[PDB]
Amino acid sequence: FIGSSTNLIMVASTTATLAAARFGLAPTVKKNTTAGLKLVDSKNSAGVISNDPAGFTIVDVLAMGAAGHGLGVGIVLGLKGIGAL
């Protein structure tokens, strides 16, 4: 399984979301989205004491790991349904 065509989709789809939210290409705890599609600062409703320089909390890790697993399950099963893998 390690290195197979389904592992390479899942890791590269989870790390894509984990690098998207950290480097300002996806919303986080600290940053949300406006009525348009502009990436704006938040209120956060509790305050975070994340030592990470971009404030990337473990809540962001869970959110974007769930999103990356969702995109990976979608791409893997859609490629199984389309015939190409």
Binding site: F1, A46, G47, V48, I49, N51, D52, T57, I58
Partner: protein
Amino acid sequence: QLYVGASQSSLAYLDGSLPGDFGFDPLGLLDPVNSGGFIEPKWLQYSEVIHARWAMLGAAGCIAPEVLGAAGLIPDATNIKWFESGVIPPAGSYNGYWADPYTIFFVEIVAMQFAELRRLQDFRYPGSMGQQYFLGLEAIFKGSGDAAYPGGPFFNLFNLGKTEAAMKELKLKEIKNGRLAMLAMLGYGAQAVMTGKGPFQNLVEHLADPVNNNILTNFAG
């Protein structure tokens, strides 16, 4: 702070006392304003301590017959896994005890109503338990202000932690091994459901082939 995952909302009141404190309350159950019921901070600290020391007795006691049977110090009749002791008779019951497990369970019922209702009546009534006659033994049960740490002549036999700083370090280290052993009990139960083998046999099989015998190659592939 320590333990990232902590928030600012669980840090203003949460000062640094209340042993084992690291700020990790991401939901904010322990929060004194508008609290009530079983979500009171005193009950939560008390039940963490109780869960901690029950789980560390259980974490030593699930691994102990299988380790001591691996050394051969106990015979192979008592070398059974922890879930085949008779606690779960669908998983297996050891029939070589001195009684029916329901006889033993009624003895446990009587002994634990006496152990536990007395244990609760010093949480509810902190000055109690040294007042009525309990065979002269009520002089032990006077307790202290804190319900999780009575510390009589029995519960603090050797008077360990005389000074305040050593007592805070011991209250810290108890919670530390207790949280580690609560996770160990979770990883005895969830790891004995999935594998079907004992915890020591899981450790031996992980130390034999770490890659080919782990969590990933245990989904029955």
